[PDB]
């Protein structure tokens, strides 16, 4: 109703942000959504991962076109537990392991720090 036709996760994000804003307004003090500042790595290149082990992605089970063009049965099927674990074990763990207990992140969020300059 506000952004126009978009994908569903955008609508869900809008709903969550609006819920937080509405809770703030009901508490009495209306506060606009503030986006935190994150430290991110933008200099990364594939040559930084030349040593990582190459693992194939989980296969996608898709129904045959001839059999699926006649019914409304679901096309793709859910992965198995073994395949799910093997797929989730392919993660590179890019985020910091100390994110929830880092104090530098908290302090750079508490102050309007401009790192680019």
């Amino acid at each position: 109703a506000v952004t126009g036709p978009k994908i569903a996760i955008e609508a869900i994000a809008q709903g969550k942000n609006a819920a937080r804003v509405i809770d703030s307004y009901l508490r009495g003090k209306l506060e606009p959504i503030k986006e935190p500042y994150y430290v991110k790595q933008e200099d990364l290149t594939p040559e930084d991962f030349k040593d990582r082990e190459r693992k194939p992605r989980v296969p996608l089970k898709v129904a045959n076109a001839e059999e699926r063009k006649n019914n409304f049965r679901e096309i793709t099927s859910t992965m198995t537990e073994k395949e799910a674990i093997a797929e989730a074990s392919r993660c590179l763990e890019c985020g910091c392991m100390d994110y929830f207990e880092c104090q530098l992140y908290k302090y750079v969020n508490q102050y309007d720090v401009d790192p680019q300059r």
Binding site: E67, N71, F72, R73
Partner: protein
């Protein structure tokens, strides 16, 4: 859950024919299907009631959409209750089909003479 006997009720002559007395044997019959079947890879295989009813509704809707109204026939047995027959008539109205009949039904003559086939 098994039927063991059938007895007549002493209403008038207290009588039952061969069918009512002995053909109740089909209730215990082990050849009765208890789960729906849908066509996978060209063969009927068991499924859940929700998926089977969804498939039924989508097939009927596809037939109605492609071939227009009055393209679906409902051939209902005459052993169903009054409520089931009325519900089938309602569903036929929902499918925009007036072909609501039975293969056991003979051409009526009494409603053109007296008014009601009864």
């Amino acid at each position: 859950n098994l039927i063991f006997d059938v007895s007549p009720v002493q209403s008038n002559e207290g009588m039952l024919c061969a069918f009512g007395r002995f053909g109740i044997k089909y209730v215990n019959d082990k050849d009765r299907i208890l789960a729906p079947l849908i066509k996978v890879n060209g063969e009927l295989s068991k499924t859940t009631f929700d998926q089977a009813l969804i498939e039924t509704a989508k097939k009927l809707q596809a037939i109605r959409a492609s071939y227009g109204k009055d393209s679906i026939a409902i051939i209902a047995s005459q052993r169903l209750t009054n409520e089931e027959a009325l519900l089938l008539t309602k569903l036929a109205q929902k499918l925009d089909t007036t072909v609501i009949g039975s293969f056991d039904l003979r051409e009526s003559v009494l409603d053109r003479i007296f008014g009601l086939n009864a």
